[PDB]
Design an enzyme around this catalytic site. Structure first.
Site, PDB file in Angstrom:
ATOM      1  N   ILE B  10       0.778  -1.230   0.000  1.00  0.00           N
ATOM      2  CA  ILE B  10       0.000   0.000   0.000  1.00  0.00           C
ATOM      3  C   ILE B  10       0.814   1.288   0.000  1.00  0.00           C
ATOM      4  O   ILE B  10       0.427   2.266  -0.638  1.00  0.00           O
ATOM      5  CB  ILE B  10      -0.963  -0.011   1.199  1.00  0.00           C
ATOM      6  N   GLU B  12       5.010   2.993   1.616  1.00  0.00           N
ATOM      7  CA  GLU B  12       6.377   2.652   1.988  1.00  0.00           C
ATOM      8  C   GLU B  12       6.922   3.326   3.241  1.00  0.00           C
ATOM      9  O   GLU B  12       6.986   4.554   3.329  1.00  0.00           O
ATOM     10  CB  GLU B  12       7.341   2.926   0.830  1.00  0.00           C
ATOM     11  N   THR B  14      10.187   3.644   5.990  1.00  0.00           N
ATOM     12  CA  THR B  14      11.585   3.851   5.640  1.00  0.00           C
ATOM     13  C   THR B  14      12.427   2.660   6.088  1.00  0.00           C
ATOM     14  O   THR B  14      13.608   2.549   5.747  1.00  0.00           O
ATOM     15  CB  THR B  14      12.122   5.145   6.258  1.00  0.00           C
ATOM     16  N   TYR B  15      11.806   1.776   6.863  1.00  0.00           N
ATOM     17  CA  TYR B  15      12.456   0.558   7.340  1.00  0.00           C
ATOM     18  C   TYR B  15      11.505  -0.577   7.003  1.00  0.00           C
ATOM     19  O   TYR B  15      11.598  -1.673   7.560  1.00  0.00           O
ATOM     20  CB  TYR B  15      12.682   0.588   8.855  1.00  0.00           C
ATOM     21  N   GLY B  16      10.577  -0.297   6.093  1.00  0.00           N
ATOM     22  CA  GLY B  16       9.618  -1.308   5.702  1.00  0.00           C
ATOM     23  C   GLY B  16       8.659  -0.894   4.604  1.00  0.00           C
ATOM     24  O   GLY B  16       9.049  -0.315   3.583  1.00  0.00           O
ATOM     25  N   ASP B 127       5.060  16.651  11.237  1.00  0.00           N
ATOM     26  CA  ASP B 127       5.207  16.235   9.854  1.00  0.00           C
ATOM     27  C   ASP B 127       3.834  16.097   9.216  1.00  0.00           C
ATOM     28  O   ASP B 127       3.589  15.188   8.427  1.00  0.00           O
ATOM     29  CB  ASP B 127       6.002  14.927   9.744  1.00  0.00           C
ATOM     30  N   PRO B 130      -0.488  16.313   3.542  1.00  0.00           N
ATOM     31  CA  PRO B 130      -1.576  15.535   2.937  1.00  0.00           C
ATOM     32  C   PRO B 130      -1.327  14.031   2.726  1.00  0.00           C
ATOM     33  O   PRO B 130      -2.268  13.213   2.649  1.00  0.00           O
ATOM     34  CB  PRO B 130      -1.775  16.233   1.647  1.00  0.00           C
ATOM     35  N   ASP B 145       1.324   8.452  10.458  1.00  0.00           N
ATOM     36  CA  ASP B 145       2.767   8.616  10.462  1.00  0.00           C
ATOM     37  C   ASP B 145       3.315   9.460  11.614  1.00  0.00           C
ATOM     38  O   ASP B 145       3.653  10.623  11.437  1.00  0.00           O
ATOM     39  CB  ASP B 145       3.227   9.217   9.127  1.00  0.00           C
TER      40      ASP B 145
HETATM   41  O1  LIG Z   1      -4.697   1.995   6.059  1.00  0.00           O
HETATM   42  C1  LIG Z   1      -3.692   2.478   6.580  1.00  0.00           C
HETATM   43  N1  LIG Z   1      -3.351   2.381   7.829  1.00  0.00           N
HETATM   44  C2  LIG Z   1      -2.206   3.016   8.093  1.00  0.00           C
HETATM   45  C3  LIG Z   1      -1.574   3.106   9.358  1.00  0.00           C
HETATM   46  C4  LIG Z   1      -0.355   3.832   9.455  1.00  0.00           C
HETATM   47  C5  LIG Z   1       0.208   4.441   8.302  1.00  0.00           C
HETATM   48  S1  LIG Z   1       1.727   5.354   8.373  1.00  0.00           S
HETATM   49  O2  LIG Z   1       1.471   6.726   7.995  1.00  0.00           O
HETATM   50  O3  LIG Z   1       2.710   4.587   7.634  1.00  0.00           O
HETATM   51  O4  LIG Z   1       2.126   5.305   9.803  1.00  0.00           O
HETATM   52  C6  LIG Z   1      -0.441   4.340   7.029  1.00  0.00           C
HETATM   53  C7  LIG Z   1      -1.666   3.617   6.940  1.00  0.00           C
HETATM   54  C8  LIG Z   1      -2.674   3.266   5.847  1.00  0.00           C
HETATM   55  C9  LIG Z   1      -2.740   3.575   4.520  1.00  0.00           C
HETATM   56  N2  LIG Z   1      -3.744   3.159   3.774  1.00  0.00           N
HETATM   57  C10 LIG Z   1      -3.676   3.546   2.494  1.00  0.00           C
HETATM   58  C11 LIG Z   1      -4.598   3.273   1.449  1.00  0.00           C
HETATM   59  C12 LIG Z   1      -4.305   3.800   0.152  1.00  0.00           C
HETATM   60  C13 LIG Z   1      -3.117   4.574  -0.079  1.00  0.00           C
HETATM   61  C14 LIG Z   1      -2.201   4.837   0.983  1.00  0.00           C
HETATM   62  C15 LIG Z   1      -2.514   4.301   2.263  1.00  0.00           C
HETATM   63  C16 LIG Z   1      -1.855   4.332   3.610  1.00  0.00           C
HETATM   64  O5  LIG Z   1      -0.809   4.898   3.851  1.00  0.00           O
END
Ligand SMILES: O=C1Nc2ccc(S(=O)(=O)O)cc2/C1=C1/Nc2ccccc2C1=O
Lengths: 258, 296
Positions: B10, B12, B14-16, B127, B130, B145
């Site tokens: 879904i 990226e 930075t360590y996974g 940080d 969008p 994040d």
């Molecule tokens: O469903 C999700 N749960 C999380 C939890 C934590 C993160 S993090 O920002 O990497 O910490 C990202 C996500 C996340 C994401 N779901 C999606 C769906 C489509 C496109 C990008 C992301 C995404 O980053």
């Protein structure tokens, strides 16, 4: 920018109770003593001193140690391995530039391998279930300082000095919450340096009074009088430096009038 | 780890990475973010240490929920609640049609809630952009994040300067103020609010000095009147070109009088005067807010 001060003071007050370690865990440790622990924090003081770490990092480390030893019995030969990992985790959490792993192995003059440090880290994180944002005496003192009219370089430094002295002796300090030790240390700092007492404004903010702090004041005042004679001396040496306005050189009151 | 069925990559880390997965037994769809360890290096990344401890401390409808931490010697898996998309992507998918004020209002409202919560628990996100905001098919939007986040004290002391994505970075950081706090997250939100309206980054500089000037040309070059203390900051330069303040209705023209008032308060130069997330929640701009729904 003081719009969140109270929401935070309240949140830390809730957490300090949830993060607090078991008051009499030592009594249950089969191999280690308070004395050995004292030597451990004393050493961490100079280590934080040698690497220019925040005092906040010192307090965190001690919080982690006491919490780890609240559910894990450790052999006297491993106490230092726990304290090293706890210090490394505190730095990774609180420092802008945390000294790298090799520094932490080095300070043990290779009493342990890098591997042992890293594994203990993993273990400690588990035992603490990754709950590292613990409130400390430092976080409270820093807040009590805003109630000083006007700021007083020496009072702050003395308050920090006293707060740090409490890290060294589990007995009696493990039986007080950090916010309380902080009140006692601030009052005793204040009184000693200016003659003033726990501000009217802090009773309102904290709900503590001289009367509620008295049990702690008594102890801290005693530790203060006996400070020059304590087996551990890294905090006193530390607080002789100009960075702390040499407050550890100040003479403690004969009595507190209470 | 056994009861999970990975669905598709879904994003990226930075360590996974981040994978969509579904708990086989409960049926729950989750997001897995794997963090690489491997011994003989530096142990657990401090960014994960902070992310996990702080996030566990943040339970709120507008902050992604960390469901579990699968801790192994080789690697560390963070299990999060799943969300359909992120704000950038969604903004692009609307690039031609625009985002309806109802949604813009609802998203901003929610975002201000998640932040007020973070700040109420002494946490600086640092940080907000969008890409780090997630939205589901229900009208929900959340902070994600927490990799650059940190617990702060009262008062604050000097923290890391290398902070916040340039486009959403506040002037007090760009100017080198030795103390920065919660107001920096508000700056980011004002830029995102602005961005949701017009559809294109408010200040897209490509260098710190270019970012500043792009800021000065919109809100005017700051002076001791408007922001007591600038001329003394570490990175301030008396050579700075003195631009005049551009009247706010031209910065985000499609904005009603309330939007203008709110945005202007979120973009205040002096960090002591720029509105807090709490206060912002009561601003007239939200009197008609609803939790509409996305456009997917
Ligand atoms: O469903 C999700 N749960 C999380 C939890 C934590 C993160 S993090 O920002 O990497 O910490 C990202 C996500 C996340 C994401 N779901 C999606 C769906 C489509 C496109 C990008 C992301 C995404 O980053």
């Amino acid at each position: 920018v003081p719009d969140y001060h109270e929401d935070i003071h309240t949140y830390l007050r809730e957490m300090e109770v949830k993060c607090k370690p078991k008051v009499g865990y030592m009594k249950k440790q089969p191999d280690i003593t308070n004395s050995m622990r004292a030597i451990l924090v004393d050493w961490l003081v100079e280590v934080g001193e040698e690497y220019k770490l925040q005092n906040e990092t010192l307090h965190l480390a001690v919080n982690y140690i006491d919490r780890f030893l609240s559910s894990m019995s450790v052999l006297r030969g491993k106490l230092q391995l726990v304290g090293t990992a706890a210090m490394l985790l505190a730095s990774k959490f609180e420092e802008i530039y945390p000294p790298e792993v090799a520094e932490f192995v080095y300070i043990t003059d290779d009493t342990y391998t890098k591997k042992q440090v890293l594994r203990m880290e993993h273990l400690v994180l588990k035992v603490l279930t990754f709950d590292l944002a613990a409130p400390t005496v430092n976080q409270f003192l820093t807040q009590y300082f805003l109630h000083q009219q006007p700021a007083n370089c020496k009072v702050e430094s003395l308050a920090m000095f006293l707060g740090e002295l409490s890290l060294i002796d589990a007995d009696p300090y493990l039986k007080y919450l950090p916010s309380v030790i902080a009140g006692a240390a601030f009052h005793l700092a204040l009184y000693t340096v200016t003659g003033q007492s726990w501000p009217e404004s802090l009773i309102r903010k904290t709900g503590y009074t001289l009367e509620s702090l008295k049990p702690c004041l008594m102890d801290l005042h005693q530790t203060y009088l006996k400070a020059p004679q304590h087996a551990q001396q890294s905090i006193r040496e530390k607080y002789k430096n100009s960075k702390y306005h040499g407050v550890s050189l100040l003479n403690p009151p004969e009595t507190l009038n209470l | 780890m056994e009861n999970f069925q990975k669905v598709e990559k879904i994003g990226e880390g930075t360590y996974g990475v981040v994978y969509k997965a579904r708990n086989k037994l409960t049926g729950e769809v989750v997001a897995l973010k794997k963090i690489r360890l491997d011994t003989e290096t530096e142990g657990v990344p401090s960014t994960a240490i902070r992310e996990i401890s702080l996030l566990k401390e943040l339970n709120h409808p507008n902050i992604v929920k960390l469901l579990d931490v699968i801790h192994t010697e080789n690697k560390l898996y963070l299990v999060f609640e799943f969300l359909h998309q992120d704000l950038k992507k969604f903004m692009d998918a609307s690039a031609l049609t625009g985002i309806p004020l109802p949604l813009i209002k609802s998203y901003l409202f929610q975002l201000l809630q998640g932040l007020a919560f973070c700040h109420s628990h002494r946490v600086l996100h640092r940080d907000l952009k969008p890409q780090n905001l997630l939205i589901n098919t229900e009208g929900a939007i959340k902070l994600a994040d927490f990799g650059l986040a940190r617990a702060f004290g009262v008062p604050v002391r000097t923290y890391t300067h290398e902070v916040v994505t340039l486009w959403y970075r506040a002037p007090e950081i760009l100017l080198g103020c030795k103390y920065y706090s919660t107001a920096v997250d508000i700056w980011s939100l004002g830029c995102i609010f602005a961005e949701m309206v017009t559809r294109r980054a408010l200040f897209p500089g490509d260098s710190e000095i270019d970012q500043l000037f792009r800021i000065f040309r919109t809100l005017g070059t700051p002076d001791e009147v408007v922001w007591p203390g600038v001329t003394s900051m570490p990175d301030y330069k008396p050579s700075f070109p003195k631009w005049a303040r551009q009247d706010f209705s031209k910065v985000v023209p499609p904005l009603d009088e309330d939007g203008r008032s709110l945005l202007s308060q979120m973009l205040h130069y002096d960090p002591n005067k720029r509105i807090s997330a709490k206060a912002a929640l009561a601003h007239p701009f939200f009197q008609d807010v609803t939790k509409p729904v996305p456009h997917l």
